[PDB]
């Protein structure tokens, strides 16, 4: 749950960034291209595989 909270936060941040970038030109976005499952899936896989309990950028 400690990982999933931050990973859902990162998913929401990426969705917001993509949606804002797309609607700054005035067009309506699409949800499936906004959500990237790679963050949650690869982050959980990395944290379980390596044992470094956190983000990939902060191993120390």
């Amino acid at each position: 749950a400690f990982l999933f909270r931050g990973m859902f936060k990162n998913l929401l941040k990426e969705v917001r960034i993509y949606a804002q970038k797309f609607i700054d030109r005035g067009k309506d976005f699409n949800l499936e291209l906004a959500i990237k499952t790679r963050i949650i899936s690869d982050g959980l896989k990395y944290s379980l595989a390596t044992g470094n309990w956190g983000d990939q950028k902060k191993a120390h």
Partner: protein, 48 residues
Amino acid sequence: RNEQNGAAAHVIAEDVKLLQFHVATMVDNELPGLPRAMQKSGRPLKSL
């Protein structure tokens, strides 16, 4: 290149500041109070 063009006299101060960081961190990466040199994947560089 920026010395030939002349720049705006504060980009020169910015580049020399970043050149100061790059030269000194090659000699020593363990400077306190400064960001560590980063190439890749959360692993800091190994200085001399």
